[PDB]
Structure 1
Amino acid sequence: HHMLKLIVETKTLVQSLGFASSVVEKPEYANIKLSAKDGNLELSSTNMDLYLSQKIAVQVVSEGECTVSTKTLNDIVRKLPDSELTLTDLGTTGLEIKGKNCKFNLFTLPVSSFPAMDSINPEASFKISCTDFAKIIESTKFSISLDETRYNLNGVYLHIKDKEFCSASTDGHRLSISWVTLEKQIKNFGVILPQKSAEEILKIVKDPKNINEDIEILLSSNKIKFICNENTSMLSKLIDGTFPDYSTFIPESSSSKLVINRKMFADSIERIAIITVEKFRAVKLSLSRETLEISAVGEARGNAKEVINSSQDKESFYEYNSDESLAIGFNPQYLEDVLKAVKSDVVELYFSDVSAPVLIKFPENPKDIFVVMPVKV
């Protein structure tokens, strides 16, 4: 026989179904596999290039498996008011979800039609804190290319240089690099994790139940697997391409340096940028020792200017250690993405000429590097 029957804490099931449904976004056709075994409920969700397995502790009354519609199960569980639920596969009547006052019956689909997770012979595996992994993805997810005709830039480049595990991303206009030290020496490798995989594993490591724990990362030649805090494993395809050598993208020298309050800077850029039009996303930074003017123009819209004066005050800090003036343009979105990536009081910007990239560093955050090309203004 072996028919699934279990009692589960409702809140815990809701959380799991939330992760299961965001995984198959691209969804009336997506199914979730439920497996009750050894005191646990295992929920499996998968698409063309992702496989998510979540285990949660439940009262297993009878071992068994079945699959039902992800959306219908998620939608139903979110609306049940009891603290505990009973799930029971009753065969021809389907999977019964039972609260105190109501019963739902879901049609099931055969378990033989649901794929299991692929098996992997990992050439390399290591553990880092969920906090460290969250930072590296959050400092790099935003500068992935969205152009699908650039296959090798549509992910984050996860790679090892000596004992540092790094994420890099670029789209030709900016580069982001974030890294952490590893405990053990480990073989050099680099893989491009697809965007959707990066976003879903980011959401997993940020869960309050996991954020303070560890994530194990196991590598194979064509697949990457995350096991986040023992009970959640995600196995992801890799993007079939080669991430460019970014070493020449990082400026080796600078002619001038700006130190500025990050919040003040970011708020002013985004404010001045409002006047711009889609055809010309640019703000102009007119930098001098005494002031910075952020200005912008929008065709048939108007023009705008903000003045930031030099200041040694923390809330309004502005220092530009140069006798020369520099007027240089940037896409405001690309500055804003970097300024919002790191919670820092001040930010440093290293310039050369108006057509050379700016290197951006955050002084309390030495393992995060950002490079942003200018635009003609």
Structure 2
Amino acid sequence: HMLKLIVETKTLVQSLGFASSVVEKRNVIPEYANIKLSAQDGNLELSSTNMDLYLSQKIAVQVVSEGECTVSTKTLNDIVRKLPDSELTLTDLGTTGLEIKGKNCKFNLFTLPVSSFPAMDSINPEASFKISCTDFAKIIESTKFSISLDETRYNLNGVYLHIKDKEFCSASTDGHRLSISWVTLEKQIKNFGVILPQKSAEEILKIVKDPKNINEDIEILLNSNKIKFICNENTIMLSKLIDGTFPDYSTFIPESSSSKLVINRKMFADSIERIAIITVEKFRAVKLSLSRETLEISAVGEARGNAKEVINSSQDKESFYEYNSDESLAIGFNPQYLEDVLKAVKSDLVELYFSDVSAPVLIKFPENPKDIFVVMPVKV
């Protein structure tokens, strides 16, 4: 019937931060903005949903009376974050509302009937397996930034999660670049390939990176229509899948290269970002003028000016630069697309493999053999 429970405030604040990262709040079209609270068997289950995903979080509380209700996510989040008490009492007071009670204060939040809150789908899986949260965060971190934002390219608006032999892999592309990242499974899993929407990839990454989950495991259960994540037993996320066919990306990886650059990753990344400052949105491009002696990174911006930075050949790790060719190469890239790759993998050095000015660059990190990136150039 009527919920009543005592919960540690800090724990509730953390769960509501996750609820807040799910809940609909754009205020252009109708939204369902409530959170469902369910007290059962020593746990409070907090459920949040948007049109892409359903999140269920369970936290241990002192259940005085079992029950469920729903209230405004934002109002509950906003109040609980400002209460000083180490613990709070939550009591469903019926027409009076859900009461949030600390030592000196009481808030009544009007409820909405539980029947108004979307049903949690059941998932009957075709395949399921478990991997570490550390391994899953890695392949998502390495591929979430190059998802397409173009709705007409509906099959590119997510990450392609798939099995090839013993490798669990994530791939993403927006037509301008490709990212691929994988981890080796120990058990042979049924082959599958599904497209996880960007919004779900962002939320499940936040979940598995939480300190309580990052060193734990995540179970993945899926069929061709839906996917379920069970992260460290007590957090369940259900997601829709994008109905479509991810392209055969193996054709996109250059089979050979005419020159190779090795350079300190942070130095390269900092220089690109600096030089890109002069650019405008209508022409986001930096020019890499590569030679054995120096690399000149330059850019122009209409009605702003131009910019140039020189990186000299060097064998010191902190300033490393080596370009293995007697020939020069002047080739342009969108600096955001280079920065996305450079920030994705924490590595001392980075390798860039080129062919001609009109062909893509292949980017790899030396201690990271299971991450691959391809970026097409732009005319400069």
Any idea what the Cα deviations from partners look like across 1:207-241, whole Å, max 9, x if unmatched? 11111111111111200111111100000001111
TM-score, scaled relative to structure 1: 0.98
Matched-pair contact (CA < 8 Å) for 1:355–1:374: yes
- Residues 315-326 of structure 1 mapped to structure 2, 5 A cutoff: 315-326=318-329
Give the deviation of 1:116 after TM superposition: 2.8
Q: 1:28 to 1:171 in 2, by over 3 A?
A: closer
Does the 8 Å CA contact 1:28/1:69 hold for their aligned counterparts? no
Aligned to 2:253: 250
The alpha carbon displacement at 1:68 in A equals 0.9
**Which residue of structure 1 aligns with residue 116 of structure 2?**
113
* CA offsets 1:57-77 (integer angstroms, 9 cap, x no match): 000011111111111111111
In 2, the alpha carbon distance for the partners of 1:279 and 1:30 equals 37
| Distance (whole Å) between structure 1 residues aligned to residue 12 and residue 331 of structure 2 | 52
The answer to whether the 8 Å contact 1:40/1:57 transfers is yes
Deviation at 1:151, TM superposition (A): 0.6
Distance in 2 between residues matched to 1:188 and 1:25, nearest whole Å: 34
Hey, what's the Cα distance between the residues in 1 that align with 2:142 and 2:106?
A: 46
Aligned equivalents of 2:116, 2:304: Cα separation in 1: 57
Give the TM-score, by structure 2 length.
0.97
Superposed displacement of residue 25, structure 1: 3.6
Q: What's the offset of the Cα at 1:78?
A: 0.7
Question: C-alpha separation between the residues in 1 aligned to 2:24 and 2:203?
Answer: 10
Contact 1:163–1:182 (8 Å) recurs in 2: yes
Extract structure 1 runs of 4+ deviating beyond 3 A. 25-29
Measure, in 1, the Cα distance between the counterparts of 2:346 and 2:5. 44
Separation in 2 of the partners of 1:303 and 1:365? 35
In 2, Cα distance between equivalents of 1:286 and 1:111: 62
| In 2: Cα distance, 1:25 partner to 1:137 partner | 23
Deviation at 1:368, TM superposition (A): 0.4
1:282 pairs, out of 281, 285, 305, with 285
| Cα separation, 2, equivalents of 1:283 and 1:92 | 62
Structure 2 counterpart SS, 1:148: coil
1:183 Cα deviation after fit? 2.2
Equivalent residue for 2:34? 31
Distance 1:255 1:283 in 2: 21
Deviation at 1:303, TM superposition (A): 1.2
Q: Which residue of 2 aligns with 1:127?
A: 130
Per-residue deviation at 1:28? 7.5
Q: Could you tell me whether the CA contact under 8 Å between 2:224 and 2:241 is conserved in 1?
A: no
Q: Who is 2:312 aligned against?
A: 309
Unaligned runs of 5+ in 1: none
Query: What is the aligned-residue RMSD (CA, Å)?
Result: 1.1
Number of residue pairs the alignment of both structures matches: 376
Q: Is contact 2:177-2:376 (8 Å) kept?
A: yes
CA distance in 1, matches of 2:4, 2:111: 14
Q: C-alpha deviations, 1:318-337, integer Å up to 9, x for none?
A: 01111111111111110011
| 2:65 corresponds to which of 62, 65, 79 | 62
How far did 1:113 drift? Answer: 2.2
Q: Which residue of 2 is the match for residue 262 of structure 1?
A: 265
Deviation at 1:29, TM superposition (A): 4.3
2:152 alignment partner in structure 1: 149
Can you list the C-alpha shifts for 1:175-198, whole angstroms capped at 9, x where unaligned?
000100112101111111111111
Whether contact under 8 Å (1:145, 1:171) holds in the other structure is: yes
CA deviations on 1:241-276 (whole Å, 9 max, x unpaired) are 111110110001000000000000011111111111
Instruction: Give the superposition deviation at 1:166.
Output: 0.6
The answer on whether the counterparts of 2:24 and 2:32 sit within 8 Å (CA) in structure 1 is no
Q: 1:55: how far off?
A: 0.3
Equivalent position SS for 1:340: helix
